[PDB]
Ligand SMILES: CC1(C)CC(=O)N(CC(=O)N2CCC(N3N=C(c4ccc(OC(F)F)c(OC(F)F)c4)[C@H]4CC=CC[C@H]4C3=O)CC2)C(=O)C1
């Protein structure tokens with residue numbers, strides 16, 4: 001009834017689960033390629049979600065292992081390690097002082113479940129690629145948030161596998177509310193929605209109201225769900241805000257994925273997508289641009305919403321940006 005030694009080393013790494021900068025790649029190695037399952041399980045226990053939602057522990061574990069198995073280990077970026085990272089980053093963001101006691105347990109469950117499923121069965125190519133190849137996914141979803149629709153459908157469908165229904169004890173009202181929030185959150189991870197999400201986050205910062213011991217006041221679904229959508233979207237765009245050793249691995253992985261797509265586009269005579277051309281790449285300059293036009297603007301606005309809680313995150317981002325700028329030939 002005692003942990004094996006590897007299990008003990010893993011449990012020690014998992015003590016960083018409330019920290020930005022958790023060694024997720026190390027967790028992946030120590031868990032036998034089960035970082036999503038072990039991180040989710042830790043977070044569910046930490047937040048007492050099993051008791052609150054009457055989730056049988058065997059059902060949770062079965063679901064999580066099934067979910068993690070529907071991420072592809074042969075995709076370099078959009079795999080179970082990325083899912084685990086987004087979950088853990090969401091979990092840290094949800095714990096920010098400015099949001100203490102703001103969200104209900106069901107909202108919390110929604111954000112974390114959404115994070116866990118948000119890229120499941122990702123094939124390692126873009127929506128545009130799927131559309132332009134006439135792929136079955138694109139046809140199924142009428143070219144509209146193709147991947148994100150698929151991630152949702154798979155994540156929910158997996159609940160029907162043997163002993164996988166983690167929501168079996170929720171009432172229909174709880175399930176309907178949970179399902180709606182999860183859908184709203186995952187669909188918001190499609191980068192085509194980024195400018196609208198950010199515009200709404202800015203509007204919210206400009207009209208910010210604070211209240212119950214200085215935490216945010218969010219008094220309607222539209223504001224509550226916008227915050228959660230931007231929170232998971234921040235987590236999804238969190239790689240440049242992490243310690244350089246983590247960030248660089250994520251950059252290597254996304255570049256591998258992008259260049260593989262570009263190889264497939266080149267071989268078939270298609271126009272090669274932005275940053276998919278390994279023969280015409282500027283990895284460093286691309287990171288600086290990604291930070292300047294997308295990641296910083298979002299994280300700066302998030303940092304304003306939760307001021308001053310996210311200052312060290314924004315400082316790390318700004319440091320990493322200078323690092324990449326400095327390596328430009
Ligand atoms: C603005 C430019 C100067 C630089 C640039 O980016 N693009 C392409 C571009 O703007 N977009 C929008 C974002 C898209 N996108 N990009 C992701 C991503 C993740 C990690 C990255 O690096 C490192 F953190 F690991 C990364 O870095 C590299 F691209 F810079 C990109 C994902 C984000 C969310 C969901 C799915 C992934 C997704 O949809 C890609 C297309 C330019 O065209 C010029």
Ligand SMILES: [Mg+2]
Nearest residue numbers: 118119189190
């Ligand atoms: Mg995605």
Ligand code: NI
Nearest residue numbers: 072073074075
């Ligand atoms: Ni595969």
Ligand SMILES: [Zn+2]
Nearest residue numbers: 086118119236
């Ligand atoms: Zn993602």
